[PDB]
Design a protein around this ligand. Structure first.
Ligand SMILES: *[C@@H]1O[C@H](CO)[C@@H](O[C@@H]2O[C@H](CO)[C@@H](O[C@@H]3O[C@H](CO)[C@@H](O[C@@H]4O[C@H](CO)[C@@H](O)[C@H](O)[C@H]4NC(C)=O)[C@H](O[C@H]4O[C@H](CO[C@H]5O[C@H](CO)[C@@H](O)[C@H](O)[C@@H]5O)[C@@H](O)[C@H](O)[C@@H]4O)[C@@H]3O)[C@H](O)[C@H]2NC(C)=O)[C@H](O)[C@H]1NC(C)=O
Ligand SMILES: *[C@@H]1O[C@H](CO)[C@@H](O[C@@H]2O[C@H](CO)[C@@H](O[C@@H]3O[C@H](CO[C@H]4O[C@H](CO)[C@@H](O)[C@H](O)[C@@H]4O)[C@@H](O)[C@H](O[C@H]4O[C@H](CO)[C@@H](O)[C@H](O)[C@@H]4O)[C@@H]3O)[C@H](O)[C@H]2NC(C)=O)[C@H](O)[C@H]1NC(C)=O
Lengths: 222, 206, 228, 209
């Protein structure tokens, strides 16, 4: 096995409207308090449940937000969905859907949670990435003691991610959380372990991908 | 929301006790945790019931209103934020503010550090960036300093607060930025961590 | 006045939902005999009505879409939302809210607009966004142009731009959609109308990038000496 | 549902008479126009009568099975696309399928024609992007009657309404492509272009100039 996914837009504009979708293994089983939910967390904040739906379209709603939200599906299309009001940028968050399994009608299970969505809000639109290899001009190490990678810059918003020869050379990795580039953009670093003296007998590749532009690009580290 | 304490700190050998409070009914509170930047993880269910096949050190337990969570043998990796979750009126599912955990007596570890020079596609645009990477340290403390000759940090002070790795060690990065002529006219190209006051330095050269 | 606007994303992934938005302005939804509706138009094709709302909240829609569509508003934001599901690439179109109005008892017509919105429904690749200098150009032409043109593989975002030589020598001018395939995995081409001279041996460089990425990988026109 | 004619090709003033049918009863029957990225612009209002804010250059009759539309003082931008619409049974806002008016009576101009070169770039890329581009025609309605060695591949479809040029004449694209071997294994290429007349051509050599 069981896994969940959610997906939607990578950015929303200031006072526009979000919409999102959620699909899964575990397909529409009518099990032990079985349902699905939507949850969000403010930037670095606590968790917040929004809403959920069960083994028939019995469905339930937050008191404080109510008109701000609405929930349904086309059962045949096998996505759970969520639809919302127009947006104040504070509604930016880590958002997730999740699976429910509450017993005979009590006792909590949210027994699976999806990889989530980077729901992000600004008055501005998307901007695409610039990528740079980082290997230095002068060198002194020997053997597999070294590590190298690529910078990413000038994009907005996140996510961007990196892989090492389509996963095939993944070892001794470091990855750093991205930082706001002070013009109102973002920047990222990720690194992989390498032989200090044997670059070019094999090639080490930054496989960079950026969802908002859907830009995917491969560059040599050496 | 469900009220709980903000933060908990204890020795690495010690079986820590955590609690959160059910505002109503309470006797079905599940537990979950939040190691940061990532999807959360399931803990105890029903009441006291052990989740199937996840790490066995997290301790099934009960209370009537002060719903309670614990660890058996505490370990360094357990530094994370911990949450209560509840049924409530008509499917009003309720949730806590979190509680952070710190695992004292843990050694710490001195920074692993790396520095990289600016790139040709910056030099074509009169730009330059030095990329400083700070990693493998403990506790989650950092400050950072630079020596682009005698000059202060320029064109992006852009530096992370402390962040956790895959292991219970911590990391950050910094991006001192210049014009290409500032890069060519300077000659010292150096970054220094000052983590817990410890002097740790990297430098680049043509 | 009356005023309106068309808002939402430029594209979405397959199987998901349309979500697009528009507010009635310069009059009110409480005003009698009036209403609001939606129209769409696929690229280079005919237009299509979808749905209505009137001055009593009586909703309606074309039944051929009823499990696929829905339409909603929030009083608390005086805003009208159009919803679709089962998103499939053919549904790529312009989409457009607009006002409804009537004569006597059930005798109805349409009468106002906002700026209009263009949408591509898509599977997604900007993997290695290529720019090949494949130009409808040189003395192959008797057109008041030998338009320099560039051809693409894997764009997802839109709109697509074009530039050559700052337009400096141009005549007969239009941008020409020259070819297009595969929505949001795009291969496509467009042009700048330099005159009907011979061109392919010469040192020309283009732009044909799409505005949200600002990104391409590219080659000069002069790849071989046999080009005039 | 409604139905309406293809192109009604005529006139500078001599009144063209567009029609649509569907609901013969005139039941809030009306008309609208499609033009370069514009709103669907109003033509006809009421139980099919002229709007208050709109000029003398058109008159829609109430009439009968014809929802008929008379037009006067025509011009090159009026080579837009034309649509009927109506109120049906409850809430049914019926809507047309198009008729691109061709405005023959304004002076126009013979087509000018581009084939894609056997290019210096495509000779390295192994392509033959045998697409045609067309300029400088009036009237602004055109078709290509391709000559080739039967090698029709990589087709396409368009509505040419927005592609007026800076020189107020019209421009267009026509769709054909292969690999670079087919600049030499096949040779009988010509973009042949008819705009209600002229039938203009451009051939190519086996290699670019
Ligand atoms: C013969 O005539 C009979 C009537 O005399 C017909 O029976 C009736 O059948 C319908 C369904 O077909 C049933 O509908 C009721 O609709 C309510 C309104 O939609 C619904 O109330 C909910 O209200 C909240 C308000 O905030 C909303 O958030 C909900 O979305 C809303 N709708 C729904 C669908 O929830 C009524 O809810 C019933 O179910 C809940 C279940 O909740 C409990 O179980 C959960 C299990 O996981 C547990 O988690 C919860 O904590 C709860 O413990 C109950 O709480 C309610 O009391 C209620 O039972 C409901 O759907 C009518 O109620 C039926 N009437 C009767 C008397 O049964 C019959 O079909 C006719 N047959 C024919 C052939 O004609
Ligand atoms: C007892 O109490 C109720 C509530 O206070 C009063 O009103 C009834 O309420 C129900 C439910 O709201 C009404 O049902 C709805 O009626 C709409 C109106 O239809 C009439 O009007 C149009 C012309 O405007 C006629 O063409 C049509 O034949 C009807 O005469 C319908 O539009 C609704 O239909 C739904 O489906 C269509 C098609 O998909 C959609 O376009 C609509 O948006 C909508 O989704 C719906 O059926 C009911 O009509 C009301 N009854 C009466 C008698 O008023 C009662 O008045 C009160 N009883 C008494 C005797 O006072």
């Amino acid at each position: 096995q069981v896994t969940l996914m959610e997906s939607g837009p990578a950015l929303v504009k200031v006072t526009q409207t979000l919409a999102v979708t959620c699909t899964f293994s575990g397909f529409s089983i009518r099990d032990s308090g079985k349902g699905v939910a939507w949850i969000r967390q403010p930037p670095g904040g606590a968790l917040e449940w929004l809403t959920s739906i069960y083994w028939d379209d019995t469905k339930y709603h937050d008191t404080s937000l109510k008109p701000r939200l609405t929930i349904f599906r086309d059962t045949s299309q096998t996505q759970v969905i969520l639809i919302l009001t127009n947006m104040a940028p504070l509604d930016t968050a880590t958002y997730y859907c999740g699976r429910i399994n509450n017993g005979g009608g009590w006792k909590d299970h949210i027994d699976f949670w999806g990889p989530g969505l980077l729901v992000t809000v600004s008055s501005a639109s998307t901007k695409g990435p610039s990528v740079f290899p980082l290997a230095p001009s002068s060198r002194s190490t020997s053997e597999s003691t070294a590590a190298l990678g690529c910078l990413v810059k000038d994009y907005f918003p996140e996510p961007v991610t990196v892989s090492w020869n389509s996963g095939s050379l993944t070892s001794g990795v470091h990855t750093f959380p991205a930082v706001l580039q002070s013009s109102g953009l973002y920047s990222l670093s990720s690194v992989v372990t390498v032989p200090s003296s044997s670059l070019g007998t094999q090639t080490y590749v930054c496989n960079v991908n950026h969802k908002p532009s859907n830009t995917k690009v491969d560059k040599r580290v050496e | 929301a469900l009220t709980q304490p903000p933060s908990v700190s204890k020795s690495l050998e010690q079986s820590v006790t955590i609690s959160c409070t059910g505002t109503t009914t309470g006797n079905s509170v599940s537990w979950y945790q939040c190691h940061s930047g990532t999807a959360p993880r399931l803990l105890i269910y029903d009441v006291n019931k052990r989740p199937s096949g996840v790490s066995d050190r997290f301790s099934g337990s009960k209370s009537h209103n002060t719903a309670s969570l614990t660890i058996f043998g505490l370990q360094a990796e357990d530094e994370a934020d911990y949450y209560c979750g509840s049924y409530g009126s008509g499917g009003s599912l309720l949730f806590g503010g979190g509680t952070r955990l710190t695992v004292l007596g843990q050694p710490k570890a001195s920074p692993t550090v790396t520095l990289f020079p600016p790139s040709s596609e910056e030099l074509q645009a009169n730009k330059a960036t030095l990329v400083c990477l700070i990693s493998d340290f403990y506790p989650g403390v950092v400050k950072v300093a630079w020596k682009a000759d005698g000059s202060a940090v320029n064109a992006g002070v852009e530096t992370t607060t402390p962040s956790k790795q895959s292991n219970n060690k911590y990391a950050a990065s910094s991006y001192l930025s210049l014009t290409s002529d500032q890069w060519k006219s300077h000659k010292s190209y150096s970054c220094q961590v000052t983590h817990e006051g410890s002097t740790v330095e990297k430098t680049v050269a043509p």
